[PDB]
Structure formats: structure tokens, C-alpha cells
Short mmCIF file of C-alpha atoms and ligand atoms in Angstrom, two decimals:
data_model
loop_
_atom_site.label_atom_id
_atom_site.label_comp_id
_atom_site.label_asym_id
_atom_site.label_seq_id
_atom_site.Cartn_x
_atom_site.Cartn_y
_atom_site.Cartn_z
CA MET A 1 83.22 57.14 110.65
CA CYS A 2 86.83 58.29 110.73
CA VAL A 3 89.37 55.77 109.45
CA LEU A 4 92.90 54.82 110.55
CA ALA A 5 94.47 52.27 108.19
CA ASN A 6 92.21 49.36 109.19
CA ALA A 7 90.44 50.69 112.30
CA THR A 8 87.24 52.48 111.15
CA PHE A 9 86.45 54.09 114.50
CA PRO A 10 83.73 56.57 115.47
CA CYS A 11 85.10 60.09 115.28
CA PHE A 12 84.05 60.99 118.83
CA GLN A 13 86.49 58.45 120.31
CA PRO A 14 89.68 58.01 118.29
CA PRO A 15 91.91 55.33 119.83
CA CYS A 16 94.55 57.90 120.86
CA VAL A 17 92.56 59.39 123.77
CA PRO A 18 93.88 61.09 125.80
CA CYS A 19 96.41 63.65 124.54
CA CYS A 20 96.67 62.48 120.94
CA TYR A 21 98.87 65.41 119.90
CA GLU A 22 101.04 65.17 123.02
CA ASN A 23 101.75 61.45 122.73
CA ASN A 24 102.49 61.66 118.99
CA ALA A 25 101.88 64.80 116.92
CA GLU A 26 103.26 63.23 113.74
CA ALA A 27 100.72 60.40 113.68
CA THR A 28 97.81 62.56 114.83
CA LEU A 29 98.28 65.04 111.98
CA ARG A 30 98.98 62.31 109.41
CA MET A 31 95.68 60.67 110.40
CA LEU A 32 93.78 63.96 110.58
CA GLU A 33 94.94 64.88 107.06
CA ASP A 34 93.48 61.61 105.74
CA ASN A 35 89.96 62.54 106.88
CA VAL A 36 89.40 65.98 105.31
CA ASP A 37 86.73 64.64 102.96
CA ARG A 38 84.68 62.92 105.68
CA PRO A 39 81.80 65.03 107.06
CA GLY A 40 82.83 64.23 110.62
CA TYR A 41 86.15 66.02 110.16
CA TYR A 42 85.56 68.79 112.68
CA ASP A 43 84.51 66.43 115.47
CA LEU A 44 87.75 64.52 114.92
CA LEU A 45 89.67 67.80 114.97
CA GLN A 46 87.99 68.65 118.28
CA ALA A 47 88.72 65.24 119.80
CA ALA A 48 92.30 64.93 118.54
CA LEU A 49 93.68 68.03 120.29
CA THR A 50 91.81 68.33 123.62
CA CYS A 51 93.31 66.97 126.83
CA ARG A 52 94.24 67.92 130.40
CA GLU B 1 81.62 87.57 93.18
CA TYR B 2 83.99 84.69 92.68
CA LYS B 3 87.12 83.54 94.47
CA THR B 4 90.26 82.26 92.79
CA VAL B 5 91.92 79.42 94.69
CA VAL B 6 95.62 78.84 94.08
CA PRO B 7 97.37 76.04 95.99
CA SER B 8 101.05 76.07 96.79
CA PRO B 9 103.21 75.03 93.82
CA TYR B 10 104.89 71.64 93.54
CA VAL B 11 108.60 71.61 92.73
CA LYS B 12 110.43 68.39 91.81
CA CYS B 13 114.24 68.29 91.97
CA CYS B 14 115.61 66.10 89.17
CA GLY B 15 112.20 64.98 88.11
CA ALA B 16 109.33 65.85 85.86
CA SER B 17 105.77 66.37 86.97
CA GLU B 18 103.06 65.16 84.64
CA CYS B 19 100.05 67.41 84.32
CA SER B 20 96.89 65.88 85.78
CA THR B 21 93.47 67.04 84.63
CA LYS B 22 90.47 67.27 86.94
CA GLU B 23 86.89 68.52 87.06
CA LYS B 24 86.91 71.95 88.69
CA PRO B 25 85.22 75.14 87.48
CA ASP B 26 87.56 76.92 85.07
CA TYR B 27 90.51 74.72 86.08
CA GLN B 28 94.03 75.53 84.87
CA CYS B 29 97.28 73.57 85.15
CA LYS B 30 100.75 73.83 83.60
CA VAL B 31 104.25 72.46 84.15
CA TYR B 32 107.35 74.62 83.68
CA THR B 33 110.87 73.33 83.18
CA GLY B 34 114.23 74.55 84.40
CA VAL B 35 113.27 76.34 87.61
CA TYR B 36 115.89 77.14 90.27
CA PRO B 37 113.91 78.58 93.19
CA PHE B 38 115.49 80.21 96.22
CA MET B 39 114.13 80.34 99.76
CA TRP B 40 115.27 82.39 102.74
CA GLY B 41 117.95 79.93 103.85
CA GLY B 42 119.29 79.33 100.36
CA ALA B 43 118.47 77.50 97.14
CA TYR B 44 117.37 73.90 97.28
CA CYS B 45 117.29 71.47 94.34
CA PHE B 46 120.97 70.57 94.10
CA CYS B 47 119.95 69.53 90.64
CA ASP B 48 121.24 72.34 88.47
CA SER B 49 118.60 72.68 85.76
CA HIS C 1 90.50 73.87 126.56
CA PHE C 2 90.45 73.47 122.77
CA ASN C 3 93.44 75.44 121.44
CA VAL C 4 93.55 74.73 117.71
CA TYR C 5 96.63 76.95 117.55
CA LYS C 6 98.89 74.26 118.96
CA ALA C 7 99.08 72.45 115.60
CA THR C 8 99.77 75.60 113.54
CA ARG C 9 102.95 77.60 113.06
CA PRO C 10 103.89 81.02 111.67
CA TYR C 11 105.82 81.08 108.42
CA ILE C 12 108.10 83.22 106.24
CA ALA C 13 106.93 84.30 102.79
CA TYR C 14 107.86 86.85 100.12
CA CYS C 15 106.92 90.52 100.31
CA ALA C 16 107.39 92.56 97.13
CA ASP C 17 108.53 95.64 99.02
CA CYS C 18 109.05 95.93 102.77
CA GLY C 19 108.34 99.62 103.25
CA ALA C 20 111.55 100.75 101.54
CA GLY C 21 110.96 99.64 97.94
CA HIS C 22 113.14 96.55 98.37
CA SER C 23 111.97 92.94 98.58
CA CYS C 24 112.86 90.36 101.20
CA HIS C 25 111.42 87.23 102.78
CA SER C 26 109.50 88.77 105.63
CA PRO C 27 107.59 87.33 108.61
CA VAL C 28 104.67 89.78 108.30
CA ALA C 29 103.72 89.06 104.69
CA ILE C 30 100.20 90.04 103.63
CA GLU C 31 97.87 87.47 102.08
CA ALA C 32 94.38 88.37 100.79
CA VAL C 33 92.57 91.46 102.08
CA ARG C 34 88.81 90.94 102.32
CA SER C 35 86.47 93.92 102.22
CA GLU C 36 83.01 92.36 101.90
CA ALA C 37 81.41 94.24 104.81
CA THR C 38 79.19 97.24 104.13
CA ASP C 39 80.47 99.50 106.92
CA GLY C 40 83.94 99.29 105.41
CA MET C 41 86.02 97.05 107.67
CA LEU C 42 88.90 94.99 106.33
CA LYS C 43 90.26 91.52 107.16
CA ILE C 44 93.99 91.27 106.51
CA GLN C 45 95.89 87.98 106.79
CA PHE C 46 99.34 88.11 108.32
CA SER C 47 101.79 85.31 108.09
CA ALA C 48 102.54 85.92 111.79
CA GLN C 49 99.72 84.86 114.08
CA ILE C 50 98.94 87.25 116.89
CA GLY C 51 97.49 86.48 120.31
CA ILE C 52 99.56 83.41 121.29
CA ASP C 53 102.99 83.03 122.91
CA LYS C 54 106.08 81.06 121.85
CA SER C 55 105.14 78.49 124.49
CA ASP C 56 101.73 78.15 122.84
CA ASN C 57 99.81 79.75 125.73
CA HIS C 58 97.14 82.34 125.00
CA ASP C 59 98.16 85.93 125.68
CA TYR C 60 96.84 89.34 124.67
CA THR C 61 100.31 90.89 124.68
CA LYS C 62 102.49 88.35 122.86
CA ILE C 63 102.41 87.58 119.14
CA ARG C 64 104.07 84.67 117.36
CA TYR C 65 106.37 85.12 114.42
CA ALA C 66 108.86 83.02 112.49
CA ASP C 67 112.58 83.71 112.72
CA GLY C 68 114.67 81.35 110.61
CA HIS C 69 113.04 78.01 111.44
CA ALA C 70 112.72 79.19 115.01
CA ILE C 71 109.58 80.77 116.51
CA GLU C 72 110.03 84.09 118.30
CA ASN C 73 107.76 86.40 120.27
CA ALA C 74 106.89 90.09 119.97
CA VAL C 75 104.82 92.58 121.96
CA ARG C 76 101.24 93.36 120.86
CA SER C 77 101.93 97.07 121.05
CA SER C 78 103.70 98.49 117.99
CA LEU C 79 101.40 96.53 115.66
CA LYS C 80 100.66 99.24 113.10
CA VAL C 81 98.33 99.06 110.10
CA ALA C 82 98.09 102.06 107.79
CA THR C 83 97.03 103.44 104.41
CA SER C 84 97.39 107.04 103.23
CA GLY C 85 96.50 107.91 106.83
CA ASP C 86 96.40 105.69 109.92
CA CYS C 87 94.01 102.88 110.80
CA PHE C 88 92.20 101.81 113.95
CA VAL C 89 92.62 98.15 114.87
CA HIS C 90 89.32 96.65 116.03
CA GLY C 91 89.98 92.90 116.16
CA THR C 92 92.92 90.56 116.63
CA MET C 93 93.12 86.77 116.40
CA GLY C 94 95.47 84.33 114.71
CA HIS C 95 96.50 85.38 111.23
CA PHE C 96 93.62 87.83 110.93
CA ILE C 97 93.25 91.51 111.78
CA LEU C 98 90.36 93.96 111.56
CA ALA C 99 90.78 97.65 110.86
CA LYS C 100 88.99 100.74 109.57
CA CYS C 101 91.14 102.89 107.34
CA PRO C 102 91.05 106.21 105.51
CA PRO C 103 90.93 106.00 101.70
CA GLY C 104 94.27 105.36 100.07
CA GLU C 105 96.18 103.49 97.39
CA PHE C 106 98.08 100.91 99.46
CA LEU C 107 98.31 99.53 102.94
CA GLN C 108 101.12 98.25 105.11
CA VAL C 109 101.37 96.36 108.38
CA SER C 110 104.37 96.34 110.70
CA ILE C 111 105.56 94.99 114.05
CA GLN C 112 108.65 95.21 116.22
CA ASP C 113 111.31 92.52 116.22
CA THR C 114 112.88 90.92 119.28
CA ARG C 115 115.81 93.25 118.55
CA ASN C 116 113.33 96.17 118.37
CA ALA C 117 113.56 96.45 114.58
CA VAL C 118 110.53 97.36 112.49
CA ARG C 119 109.41 94.59 110.12
CA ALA C 120 106.75 95.62 107.62
CA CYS C 121 105.02 94.85 104.33
CA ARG C 122 102.95 97.08 102.02
CA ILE C 123 100.76 96.08 99.11
CA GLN C 124 98.91 98.05 96.47
CA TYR C 125 95.23 98.05 97.41
CA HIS C 126 92.62 100.59 96.28
CA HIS C 127 90.42 101.39 99.29
CA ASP C 128 87.48 103.74 98.76
CA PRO C 129 84.56 102.94 101.08
CA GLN C 130 81.09 104.33 100.47
CA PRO C 131 78.46 104.32 103.24
CA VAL C 132 75.08 102.72 102.73
CA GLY C 133 72.20 105.00 101.79
CA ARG C 134 71.84 107.93 99.43
CA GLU C 135 74.33 110.31 101.08
CA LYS C 136 78.13 110.08 101.12
CA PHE C 137 78.70 111.23 104.69
CA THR C 138 81.91 110.69 106.65
CA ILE C 139 80.84 110.57 110.33
CA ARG C 140 77.59 109.50 111.94
CA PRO C 141 75.28 112.22 113.24
CA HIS C 142 73.61 112.69 116.61
CA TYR C 143 70.25 112.67 114.81
CA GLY C 144 69.43 110.48 111.84
CA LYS C 145 67.89 107.27 110.54
CA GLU C 146 68.90 103.65 111.03
CA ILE C 147 69.67 101.64 107.88
CA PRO C 148 70.67 97.95 107.89
CA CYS C 149 74.27 97.02 107.06
CA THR C 150 76.83 94.28 107.78
CA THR C 151 80.21 93.93 109.49
CA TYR C 152 82.63 91.43 110.96
CA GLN C 153 81.93 90.49 114.55
CA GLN C 154 84.50 89.73 117.22
CA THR C 155 83.14 86.28 118.06
CA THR C 156 85.73 83.51 117.71
CA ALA C 157 83.24 80.62 117.93
CA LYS C 158 82.48 78.00 115.29
CA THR C 159 82.37 79.96 112.06
CA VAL C 160 81.84 77.71 108.98
CA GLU C 161 84.90 78.94 107.07
CA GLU C 162 88.09 77.29 105.88
CA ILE C 163 91.82 77.58 105.68
CA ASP C 164 93.85 74.83 104.04
CA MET C 165 96.94 73.83 106.03
CA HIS C 166 99.73 71.43 105.16
CA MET C 167 103.11 70.23 106.36
CA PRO C 168 105.90 72.73 105.69
CA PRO C 169 108.46 71.79 103.04
CA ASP C 170 112.01 70.88 103.96
CA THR C 171 113.60 74.28 104.50
CA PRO C 172 117.14 74.52 103.11
CA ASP C 173 119.91 76.17 105.08
CA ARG C 174 123.65 76.51 104.54
CA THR C 175 124.77 77.82 107.95
CA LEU C 176 124.98 74.29 109.36
CA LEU C 177 128.07 73.20 107.37
CA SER C 178 131.54 73.70 108.88
CA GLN C 179 134.74 72.70 107.08
CA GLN C 180 137.69 72.12 109.42
CA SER C 181 140.33 70.23 107.42
CA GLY C 182 139.16 67.90 104.67
CA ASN C 183 136.10 67.04 106.74
CA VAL C 184 132.64 68.52 107.23
CA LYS C 185 130.61 68.95 110.40
CA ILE C 186 126.84 69.40 110.67
CA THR C 187 125.34 71.08 113.71
CA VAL C 188 122.56 69.70 115.92
CA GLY C 189 120.18 70.78 118.66
CA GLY C 190 116.98 68.81 118.18
CA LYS C 191 116.43 69.27 114.45
CA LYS C 192 116.76 66.27 112.15
CA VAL C 193 118.27 67.36 108.86
CA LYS C 194 118.60 65.72 105.46
CA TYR C 195 121.86 65.62 103.56
CA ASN C 196 122.94 64.73 100.03
CA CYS C 197 126.69 64.73 99.36
CA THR C 198 128.25 63.52 96.10
CA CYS C 199 131.39 62.19 97.81
CA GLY C 200 132.23 58.52 97.40
CA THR C 201 129.71 55.77 98.12
CA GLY C 202 126.13 56.15 99.36
CA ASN C 203 126.11 58.94 101.96
CA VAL C 204 122.61 60.40 101.85
CA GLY C 205 119.87 60.37 104.45
CA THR C 206 118.63 62.11 107.56
CA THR C 207 120.52 62.65 110.79
CA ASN C 208 120.23 63.94 114.35
CA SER C 209 123.95 63.94 115.15
CA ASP C 210 127.24 65.38 113.97
CA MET C 211 129.47 63.46 111.59
CA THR C 212 132.65 63.94 109.59
CA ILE C 213 132.81 62.88 105.95
CA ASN C 214 136.64 63.17 106.11
CA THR C 215 136.59 63.16 102.27
CA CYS C 216 135.30 66.29 100.53
CA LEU C 217 134.60 69.97 101.14
CA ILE C 218 131.25 71.75 101.64
CA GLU C 219 130.68 72.28 97.91
CA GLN C 220 128.87 68.93 97.78
CA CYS C 221 126.74 68.72 100.94
CA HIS C 222 123.63 70.60 102.03
CA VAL C 223 121.17 70.70 104.90
CA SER C 224 117.38 70.75 104.69
CA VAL C 225 115.60 70.95 108.03
CA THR C 226 112.52 68.73 107.93
CA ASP C 227 110.40 70.08 110.79
CA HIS C 228 107.37 67.97 110.12
CA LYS C 229 105.34 68.07 113.33
CA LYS C 230 102.89 70.94 112.80
CA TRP C 231 100.76 72.58 110.09
CA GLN C 232 101.73 75.88 108.47
CA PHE C 233 99.47 77.18 105.60
CA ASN C 234 98.59 76.60 101.93
CA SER C 235 100.31 79.68 100.62
CA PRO C 236 101.30 80.26 96.98
CA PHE C 237 104.69 81.57 98.13
CA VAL C 238 105.94 78.37 99.84
CA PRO C 239 106.31 75.04 98.01
CA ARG C 240 104.42 71.81 98.66
CA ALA C 241 105.97 68.59 99.92
CA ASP C 242 104.29 65.70 98.10
CA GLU C 243 102.66 65.29 94.71
CA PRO C 244 99.00 64.44 95.57
CA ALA C 245 98.80 67.03 98.42
CA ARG C 246 97.80 66.33 102.03
CA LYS C 247 95.69 69.29 103.19
CA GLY C 248 93.74 70.12 106.33
CA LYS C 249 91.22 72.63 107.64
CA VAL C 250 91.02 75.35 110.29
CA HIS C 251 88.15 77.78 110.91
CA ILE C 252 88.82 81.51 110.70
CA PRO C 253 87.44 84.03 113.21
CA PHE C 254 85.30 87.14 112.72
CA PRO C 255 82.21 86.03 110.75
CA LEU C 256 80.02 88.40 108.75
CA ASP C 257 76.91 89.64 110.54
CA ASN C 258 73.94 92.01 110.40
CA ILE C 259 73.80 95.37 112.19
CA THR C 260 72.30 98.85 111.66
CA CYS C 261 74.13 102.12 111.04
CA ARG C 262 72.96 105.69 111.60
CA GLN D 1 80.96 85.94 79.35
CA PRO D 2 84.00 87.12 81.32
CA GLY D 3 84.01 90.51 82.97
CA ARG D 4 80.23 91.06 82.69
CA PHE D 5 77.10 90.15 84.63
CA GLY D 6 76.93 86.40 84.88
CA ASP D 7 80.56 85.43 84.36
CA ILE D 8 79.91 82.77 86.99
CA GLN D 9 76.44 81.24 87.22
CA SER D 10 74.91 78.90 89.76
CA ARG D 11 71.44 77.43 89.47
CA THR D 12 70.65 78.00 93.17
CA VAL D 13 72.45 79.21 96.28
CA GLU D 14 72.92 75.62 97.49
CA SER D 15 73.59 74.11 94.07
CA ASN D 16 76.76 72.03 93.87
CA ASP D 17 77.54 72.77 90.22
CA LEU D 18 78.98 76.10 89.04
CA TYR D 19 79.64 77.62 85.63
CA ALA D 20 82.69 79.87 85.51
CA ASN D 21 84.07 81.74 82.49
CA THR D 22 86.60 84.26 83.82
CA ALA D 23 89.56 83.87 81.42
CA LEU D 24 92.06 82.57 83.96
CA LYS D 25 95.58 82.03 82.62
CA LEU D 26 98.91 81.02 84.11
CA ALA D 27 102.43 82.31 83.43
CA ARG D 28 105.97 81.11 84.07
CA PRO D 29 107.53 82.02 87.42
CA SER D 30 110.33 84.55 87.35
CA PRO D 31 113.81 83.02 87.71
CA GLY D 32 114.96 82.15 91.21
CA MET D 33 111.49 82.52 92.69
CA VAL D 34 108.40 80.57 93.80
CA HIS D 35 105.12 82.42 93.35
CA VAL D 36 102.58 81.02 90.78
CA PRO D 37 101.71 84.04 88.59
CA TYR D 38 98.39 84.43 86.84
CA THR D 39 96.23 86.96 85.01
CA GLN D 40 92.48 86.78 85.18
CA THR D 41 89.65 89.13 84.26
CA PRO D 42 88.10 90.93 87.26
CA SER D 43 84.67 90.06 88.51
CA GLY D 44 81.50 90.82 86.61
CA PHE D 45 79.24 91.09 89.64
CA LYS D 46 81.51 93.84 90.97
CA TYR D 47 81.55 95.41 87.52
CA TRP D 48 77.75 95.29 87.29
CA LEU D 49 77.37 96.75 90.79
CA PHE E 1 105.13 121.28 100.59
CA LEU E 2 107.86 119.68 102.63
CA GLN E 3 109.56 120.39 105.93
CA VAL E 4 112.66 119.11 107.66
CA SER E 5 112.96 119.23 111.44
CA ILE E 6 115.11 118.07 114.33
CA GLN E 7 115.34 118.32 118.12
CA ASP E 8 117.57 121.01 119.62
CA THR E 9 120.31 120.50 122.19
CA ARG E 10 117.78 121.74 124.76
CA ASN E 11 115.24 119.27 123.34
CA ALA E 12 113.26 121.78 121.26
CA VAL E 13 111.92 121.11 117.78
CA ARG E 14 113.40 123.25 114.98
CA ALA E 15 111.70 123.01 111.59
CA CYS E 16 111.76 124.62 108.15
CA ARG E 17 109.06 124.25 105.51
CA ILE E 18 108.96 125.16 101.81
CA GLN E 19 106.41 124.99 99.02
CA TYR E 20 107.29 122.13 96.69
CA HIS E 21 104.96 120.41 94.22
CA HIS E 22 105.73 116.70 94.48
CA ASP E 23 104.01 114.37 92.02
CA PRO E 24 106.19 111.43 90.96
CA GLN E 25 105.28 109.10 88.13
CA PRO E 26 106.97 105.74 87.51
CA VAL E 27 108.88 104.85 84.38
CA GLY E 28 106.76 102.96 81.87
CA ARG E 29 103.22 103.16 80.54
CA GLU E 30 101.29 102.46 83.76
CA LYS E 31 100.90 104.75 86.77
CA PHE E 32 101.31 102.16 89.50
CA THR E 33 102.10 102.68 93.20
CA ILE E 34 103.79 99.57 94.61
CA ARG E 35 106.02 97.17 92.69
CA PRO E 36 104.40 93.78 91.98
CA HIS E 37 105.78 90.29 92.49
CA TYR E 38 105.59 89.64 88.73
CA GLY E 39 106.45 92.13 86.01
CA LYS E 40 109.04 93.55 83.63
CA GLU E 41 112.39 95.25 84.20
CA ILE E 42 112.67 98.76 82.75
CA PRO E 43 115.79 100.95 83.01
CA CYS E 44 115.45 103.91 85.39
CA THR E 45 117.78 106.06 87.54
CA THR E 46 118.49 106.69 91.22
CA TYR E 47 120.93 108.29 93.64
CA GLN E 48 123.45 105.82 95.05
CA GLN E 49 124.92 105.84 98.54
CA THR E 50 128.58 105.78 97.50
CA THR E 51 130.74 108.71 98.63
CA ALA E 52 133.63 108.09 96.21
C1 LIG F 301 121.25 63.96 95.46
O1 LIG F 301 121.74 64.88 94.50
C2 LIG F 301 122.06 64.28 93.24
C3 LIG F 301 122.61 65.38 92.37
O2 LIG F 301 124.03 65.43 92.42
C4 LIG F 301 120.83 63.60 92.63
O3 LIG F 301 121.28 62.82 91.53
C5 LIG F 301 120.53 63.07 90.33
O4 LIG F 301 119.42 62.16 90.19
C6 LIG F 301 118.66 62.32 88.98
C7 LIG F 301 117.55 61.30 89.03
O5 LIG F 301 118.04 60.01 89.35
C8 LIG F 301 119.56 62.17 87.75
O6 LIG F 301 118.81 62.41 86.57
C9 LIG F 301 119.04 61.28 85.68
O7 LIG F 301 119.92 61.62 84.61
C10 LIG F 301 120.26 60.49 83.78
C11 LIG F 301 121.29 60.94 82.76
O8 LIG F 301 122.58 60.83 83.36
C12 LIG F 301 118.97 59.94 83.13
O9 LIG F 301 119.28 58.76 82.42
C13 LIG F 301 117.91 59.63 84.21
O10 LIG F 301 116.70 59.19 83.60
C14 LIG F 301 117.68 60.84 85.11
O11 LIG F 301 117.14 61.85 84.29
C15 LIG F 301 120.72 63.15 87.85
O12 LIG F 301 121.60 62.98 86.75
C16 LIG F 301 121.47 62.92 89.15
N1 LIG F 301 122.61 63.83 89.25
C17 LIG F 301 123.86 63.44 89.00
C18 LIG F 301 124.91 64.50 89.15
O13 LIG F 301 124.13 62.29 88.66
C19 LIG F 301 120.14 62.68 93.63
O14 LIG F 301 118.88 62.27 93.12
C20 LIG F 301 119.94 63.38 94.97
N2 LIG F 301 119.38 62.45 95.94
C21 LIG F 301 118.14 62.55 96.41
C22 LIG F 301 117.73 61.51 97.41
O15 LIG F 301 117.38 63.44 96.05
C1 LIG F 302 71.15 89.48 107.29
O1 LIG F 302 69.75 89.22 107.42
C2 LIG F 302 69.16 88.67 106.24
C3 LIG F 302 67.67 88.61 106.50
O2 LIG F 302 67.36 87.60 107.44
C4 LIG F 302 69.78 87.30 105.97
O3 LIG F 302 69.21 86.72 104.80
C5 LIG F 302 68.50 85.52 105.18
O4 LIG F 302 69.33 84.61 105.90
C6 LIG F 302 68.65 83.41 106.31
C7 LIG F 302 69.67 82.58 107.07
O5 LIG F 302 69.05 81.53 107.80
C8 LIG F 302 68.07 82.66 105.10
O6 LIG F 302 67.28 81.59 105.60
C9 LIG F 302 67.46 80.41 104.78
O7 LIG F 302 66.27 80.16 104.04
C10 LIG F 302 66.32 78.99 103.22
C11 LIG F 302 65.09 78.96 102.36
O8 LIG F 302 65.29 77.99 101.35
C12 LIG F 302 66.45 77.78 104.15
O9 LIG F 302 66.45 76.59 103.38
C13 LIG F 302 67.75 77.89 104.94
O10 LIG F 302 67.90 76.76 105.81
C14 LIG F 302 67.83 79.21 105.71
O11 LIG F 302 66.93 79.11 106.80
C15 LIG F 302 67.21 83.59 104.25
O12 LIG F 302 66.82 82.94 103.04
C16 LIG F 302 67.99 84.85 103.91
N1 LIG F 302 67.26 85.74 103.01
C17 LIG F 302 66.12 86.43 103.22
C18 LIG F 302 65.45 86.29 104.56
O13 LIG F 302 65.65 87.15 102.35
C19 LIG F 302 71.28 87.47 105.78
O14 LIG F 302 71.89 86.19 105.63
C20 LIG F 302 71.90 88.18 106.97
N2 LIG F 302 73.31 88.44 106.73
C21 LIG F 302 74.28 88.00 107.53
C22 LIG F 302 73.83 87.21 108.72
O15 LIG F 302 75.46 88.22 107.31
#
């Protein structure tokens, strides 16, 4: 349900997996700020900053 | 008991900010002119007044 | 693991008096104090988050604090919270701290510096707890009743609470200008800075390298570091960046919970 | 009314709408400073308690 | 009361204590404790650190 410009992806699997923050923090936070109103915000927060 | 929420202020350097109304409980907004704020490193807004 | 604290940064705000009656921009500034638990525990917000290292790794000994657009580290000992008397620190995570204090008319928090200097902040706060029941006792007995009450627990799980975060504003600084002879030099090191000089033709913009204007003195230029990679906080003492706001969310630890007291 | 029982009213715990009458006002910032002042009547649930 | 104390040369504490009723009140019409971030300026007095 989360949206990136013209992507409209499910929030479990944003297209930045893996290491969204590590590859580009700027873009990850700019995208994650755009989705504060969506109910699936916290799942996207969990998936955006979790990698090994 | 209530809770007053106060966001961070918006400062424009050589500009004017136009007050925008919105539907919040007991909402309040104002714009003040001629500010020259200082921060720890110095004063930003080259613009004098 | 999860580590939400890798997108968040400590910040510098204003403290009205720093333990000496004078004001300065301090890294230990106190935001709201919450006292909505019946046993009489408080939740203070720092501006320096405690329990994580400079290098972002969890640690029970290191605490993070801002030092002039550069993040420094301090030892968990020497964290003192006090009122008229002296408080007992129960919890510790992020910006938040838990303590039980004697009645008083203010409270201050303080930590050591890297140079072993005390940095503090006190605020006026009227604390007068009253225990639940029909008696105003001070200490629990070895024989008594159990009456229900509430506190803050030490769980740091999903909490259903909010903090608004946002990108920090462009911090101004004037230590980066050097005038040699009719030319200016701007220092570097991994920080892209903005400049606006009223000398000649169009010479504004951002940079990651030294240059020489060769024209004017330092009375016309300035530097604003634009560290823009990680969230800080939505604090009334630091300005915003853009007109319609950007915003974010982070859960806070220590939720309110049901217990019984004697 | 502000400062008394029921300064803020909500029709149910889950209800989305809220009535708030707490006399919140804003003031100019002091010169060379960034802090959003305000004055606002203390809670009426606390006062009633 | 108040006392003043210091360590000795042999690392012993030496103290002296007197009875003194201390009850300061700020200048103005409110009995506050800590200065606020927003208020008035009222003239007062102090002892300076100059030794001239
Ligand atoms: C870099 O700093 C300079 C200040 O030296 C900024 O220039 C200032 O820009 C504002 C807005 O364009 C000017 O205000 C204008 O004033 C004229 C009257 O002369 C009025 O007709 C306009 O409607 C507007 O109010 C301001 O005068 C000007 N300062 C000077 C000395 O000319 C510049 O904006 C800064 N650059 C950036 C990117 O922020
Ligand atoms: C301390 O314990 C009391 C007593 O249980 C808590 O009050 C109760 O909290 C529960 C939370 O689930 C409430 O249940 C709710 O009921 C509504 C009914 O419309 C339902 O729609 C919700 O989904 C939810 O299940 C309950 O109403 C509430 N009040 C009672 C039982 O009188 C209190 O929250 C506890 N305090 C804490 C945990 O800090």
C-alpha cells in the first residue's frame, strides 16, 4: 500500500531490499516521510531499516 | 487531561509566510515579522530584517 | 536486528539556565516531564539519547550526545537526576529516563563531557506525589494491604506511542571561513555546506571542496552545514526546514501498566 | 469552559472528534531567539481532581 | 544554617558551621524559582567578579 512516486508497492517488500538505509539513507527517509498517513507505516519502518 | 502540541517554528529568510488555516481542535496560528534568530553556531538569515 | 536508532540523531537546544543561572545551548536540554503514573515515577526527555554508541552500536555504558554538528560519546555513570534531594534512576532508553524523586520545586539532569566537564539543565517543576489510598505514608510496610496502581514498565517492545521526527535545519557556522589575502577559504572533511556571498556575479550554492573567491572578505560569505541524512526531533527550540513539513514517527519506550502497591 | 470540568469533551473514548476550549494564545518570540511562546489555561480535569 | 569546609594537608576535613536564616525572594511580584525562557527584564543587583 506504500507508494514511491509511481510504484505503489506492498509495504512488506519495498523495492530497496536489502539494506535500504545503507544503500541510500537520503532516499529511504524521503520515501518514509511520504507515508506517515498510511496505516501500514510501521511495517514499512520495520522493513526499511533491517538488514544483515 | 489534554496535551498541547507545538511543532517546530518555520523561519523564512527574505520571505513572508502566509498564515494557513486548518481544522484542528482549538488551533492557533500567527506570523511575526522582523525576527533575527541565533543558533549555537551563529545567526542565519543573512537578510537583515 | 531492528535498531530504529540508526536513523535518529541527538541535537542541541536551548536551556533557560544550566545549573548556574545562565542560559546556553546545551546538549542535555529537558523536554516534557510526564508524571501520569500513580506510584509517582517520572519520564523525562533528554535531547541526548542514552544507551547507544557513536558508532551506532547498542551499549549500556555509552550515551550519545551532540557536540557542534559532531556526535560524541559519554559514559553512563555520572548521569545524575535530582530535585530538592537526589533521585533513583530506574529506566534508561533513548531520549527517555525514569526516576523516583523526593518532593521539590525543580529538577535538573547532568552528564559528563568528553573533557570531563559537567553539562546540566534544570527546569521549574512542582513535584508532590501522593500515594494511593486514604493514608499519606512515605515507605511501604512489612504488613499491609494491596491496592491497585499504575507505573511505567521497562519493556521496550511495540508501544503504540509517537514522536514526530524531521530533517534537521541547515545549521549555520562561522568557524569555516578563513581570510588569507583578499581571498576566502572554506574548510572540508565530508560535510557539504551552502554559501551565499554578495561578491560579483552568481556565486551561491553548495560545495564539498575548498575554493577561493579572490575578490572579497569574509563579511559577505557564510556557511550552513546541511547534514540531511538522519532524523532529529520535532522540537519547538529548533527551526523547521520546509513550509508544508515532512514529519515521521518513532515509538517511545516504557508504556503505562497495572500493578499493585502495599 | 476553560479551566473547569469539561474544558475538553469527547463523545466516547474512541471518538475521532474533540471539543477543546482551553484559551490557548500565542506571543511574539523574544529577539534573537527561536522558541514559540504561548500562554494557556491549565487543565480542568486536573483542577477537578 | 551554613557551613564551609575543606580538606587538610593531611587529607582531613575541617569545617565550620553557623546559624543563618536564608530565604531569598526574587525581584518582582511573583515568587518563582527558575528563570523562564519567556518573560520580562527587571533591574536587580549582584556581586561582580572584577577585582579592580
Ligand atoms: C543570499 O543573500 C541575499 C542577501 O544579501 C539574498 O538576497 C535578497 O533576496 C530577497 C528576495 O529576493 C530580496 O528581497 C527583495 O527586495 C526587493 C526590493 O529591493 C523587492 O522588490 C522584492 O520583492 C524582495 O522583497 C532582498 O532584497 C535581497 N537582498 C539584497 C541585499 O538584495 C538572497 O536571496 C540569498 N540567496 C539565497 C539563495 O537565499
Ligand atoms: C488497568 O486495568 C484496567 C482494568 O482492566 C484497564 O481498563 C480496561 O482496559 C481494557 C483494555 O483492553 C478495556 O477493554 C476495552 O473494552 C472495550 C469495550 O468497548 C473494547 O472495545 C476494547 O477493544 C478493549 O477490549 C476496558 O474497557 C478497560 N476498562 C474497564 C475494564 O473498566 C486499564 O486500561 C489498565 N491500565 C493500564 C493497562 O495502564
